[PDB]
Write a protein that binds this ligand. Structure first.
Ligand SMILES: *[C@H](O)[C@H](C[C@@H]1CCNC1=O)NC(=O)[C@H](CC(=C)C)NC(=O)[C@@H](NC(=O)OCc1ccccc1)C(C)C
Ligand SMILES: *[C@H](O)[C@H](C[C@@H]1CCNC1=O)NC(=O)[C@H](CC(=C)C)NC(=O)[C@@H](NC(=O)OCc1ccccc1)C(C)C
Lengths: 306, 306
């Protein structure tokens, strides 16, 4: 037993990370087959950030401007193209460590692992969620751009995020691997606003089931509620609406623990209205919302990968 | 910015993980050079757990009893020996993915990354700390034994933990890689007791500095304290004593933020005596103690590895 915020093993992604340097900007790229993917703002100097024209900057670049570097070995760039907010650098060598992969776009409320990199070298791995406002609460310092987020499903890496920028509240914004931003953000350093966030209700319920599976039961009761009456409380506490689909998705956890979904909703209502009264749940004094129902099932049945 | 519980990239360890099956027990092993390391209780059936004699069981075993399996490839065991609570299986093939490594034993209060594995396949990676009572609060299901904990320092993997068992409070116990248990635990399934734990004071202070670096300042004050007066409060709240060595170790973080260590102690005193009053620090409503001063510096300066 136990419950931890657990990332996927990162080896498959480590073998794809390279360093991309152009001008005086250095950042990370993702090397799959004979293409290196990276944030297009690499073609920008410090005076460029404030109002850039990326098509302008890119026609003025040439292949030899891009210094791509895989560990020690130099990668010769033989072509370049822009796709939305990502740059695709064609190199003359296919990455022999290329995993089975897919480019997927995730939904707010879903989780993924981030491999934080600097100068093409991995620094650390952690888990997070795409927030309802399309930001992520990451840990990124300057030079981390081009680090990616991903999920793994047996042997296949589903890349879902590439890091581009930090917003004023210290949260982070980026694109899918087709270069399309998550949320209403642009890769310019003009004033931009994260937007009001909400708590991911279905994930909080999943985590309450994780707690019951692990022996925390003090928040349980036999009050029950209707879905409509629960959603009235959700709205008041800035939680998102729970749908019948969410209830269905929680079915297996409900079946495992013998606690009906609407009964767990009544527990969450009381926790919202009363607080935790100095107690903890899975070592937290807050209601945690960055574990999906899949994350709970995965961790409490021991699914593996390779 | 941001602050996450961040593990080391796990690729170097993934390439060492194998499956060890003997009798009807299956667990994980660590394949370095031509040796596979695994918990010696693999030589035990279910009736053996309750009072085993491992020297008895091991002389009755032979090499062909041990089924070692690296992904798909079969590893021929050519010798076996016991070292404390670990088994060393000599195989006829050296692991070509063997990293630079060391076997280190860590101190309570130190952190490491765990690569949780089942059937020799990595499932997830997470960070934790060795508790003052020599347990770890892990996430381990049945079949996870032989999973290892580690730190990485540039290219060198320092293995510090191998998983053996779960105690009744849902915490975990294991050995260093020389097979010596952390704490007063034995690999028998007789009743065993975790022992009263304490909070790792120096780590809490490190995390408060992480918070200031990241813009949480509401808990700061200009009350100050002496080391002796702080330790009187520590003892009352079941915190461990802060030493002058701990103060010295916090020096760089103190210098970076301009907050004297003893001033941060006065903040922690007020947090202990008053609570957090509905506020959070780095997204937690509890005082977090599983980040070392090194973990904070590493994450807030961006140190990498390969
Ligand atoms: C790429 O390595 C970095 C990563 C960034 C540095 C610190 N933490 C991070 O995640 N990305 C950038 O430097 C980008 C460049 C870009 C194309 C926008 N710039 C930023 O992240 C700045 N953010 C920003 O300009 O957001 C909009 C804004 C909001 C308020 C005032 C002005 C601009 C950030 C470094 C200030
Ligand atoms: C190896 O894969 C497992 C991992 C274990 C299973 C569930 N979570 C885990 O971490 N380890 C074991 O099965 C060991 C075997 C051993 C050599 C002791 N057994 C346990 O972990 C049991 N723990 C135990 O017996 O602790 C002492 C104790 C305490 C109270 C009453 C009886 C015994 C556990 C599965 C019950």
């Amino acid at each position: 037993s136990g419950f931890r915020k657990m990332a996927f093993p990162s080896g498959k992604v480590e073998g794809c990370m390279v360093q991309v340097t152009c001008g005086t900007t250095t950042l990370n790229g993702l090397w799959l087959d004979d293409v290196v993917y990276c944030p297009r703002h690499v073609i920008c100097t410090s005076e460029d950030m404030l109002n850039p024209n990326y098509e302008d900057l890119l026609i003025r670049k040439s292949n030899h401007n891009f210094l791509v570097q895989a560990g020690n070995v130099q990668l010769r760039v033989i072509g370049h193209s822009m796709q939305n907010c990502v740059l695709k650098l064609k190199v003359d060598t296919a990455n022999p460590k290329t995993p089975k992969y897919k480019f997927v776009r995730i939904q707010p409320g879903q989780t993924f692992s981030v491999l934080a990199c600097y100068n093409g070298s991995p620094s650390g791995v952690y888990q997070c969620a795409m927030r309802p406002n399309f930001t992520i609460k990451g840990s990124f310092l300057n030079g981390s751009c081009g680090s990616v987020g991903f999920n793994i499903d047996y042997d296949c890496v589903s890349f879902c995020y590439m890091h581009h920028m930090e917003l004023p509240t210290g949260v982070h914004a980026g694109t899918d691997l087709e270069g399309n931003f998550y949320g209403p953000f642009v890769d310019r350093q003009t004033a931009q606003a994260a937007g009001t966030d909400t708590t991911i209700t279905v994930n909080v319920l999943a985590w309450l089931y994780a707690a019951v599976i692990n022996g925390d039961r003090w928040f349980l009761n036999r009050f029950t509620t209707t879905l409509n009456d629960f959603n009235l409380v959700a709205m008041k506490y800035n939680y998102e609406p729970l749908t019948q689909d969410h209830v269905d998705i929680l079915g297996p956890l409900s079946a495992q623990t013998g606690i009906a979904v609407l009964d767990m909703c009544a527990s969450l209502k009381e926790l919202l209205q009363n607080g935790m009264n100095g107690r903890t749940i899975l070592g937290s004094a807050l209601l945690e919302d960055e574990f999906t129902p899949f994350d709970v099932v995965r961790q409490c049945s021991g699914v593996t990968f390779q």
